[PDB]
Amino acid sequence: VSTYDEIEIEDMTFEPENQMFTYPCPCGDRFQIYLDDMFEGEKVAVCPSCSLMIDVVFDKEDLAEYYEEAGIHPPEPI
Numbered sequence: 001v002s003t004y005d006e007i008e009i010e011d012m013t014f015e016p017e018n019q020m021f022t023y024p025c026p027c028g029d030r031f032q033i034y035l036d037d038m039f040e041g042e043k044v045a046v047c048p049s050c051s052l053m054i055d056v057v058f059d060k061e062d063l064a065e066y067y068e069e070a071g072i073h074p075p076e077p078i
Contacts, residue, residue, distance in 0.1 A: 007045075009058035016069040021056070025049060035066060039074060 012021040012031075021038075023031035029049025033042065033056060045054045064078045 004055065006055040006057060009056055009062050012045075012056065014066045014069060016066070016071070019066075019070050019072070021045070021066075023054065025052065027052065035063070035070065039063060 007023060009021070012023045012033075014021050014035075019035040021033050021035070023045060025031045025047035027047060027049040029047050031045040031047045031052075031054050033045040038056070038058065039060070043056050043058075045056050047053070060074075060078050063074065067074050067078075
């Protein structure tokens with residue numbers, strides 16, 4: 001057996017200055033994943049105070065709003 005966490009994009013915090021989604025990580029650190037990577041397909045958030053790894057569920061249209069908060073535009077329109 002093995003076990004794996006999946007989470008919804010809504011549940012994460014976005015930090016517009018950093019273009020980054022974070023989530024509370026049950027170590028000293030935070031799960032982290034970048035906006036530009038997610039646009040390309042990347043769905044895995046990494047917590048590097050340990051290693052642990054969580055799957056983020058989103059589609060492109062869930063990304064429109066955070067482009068806007070960041071002050072930028074997507075590489076291709078959504």
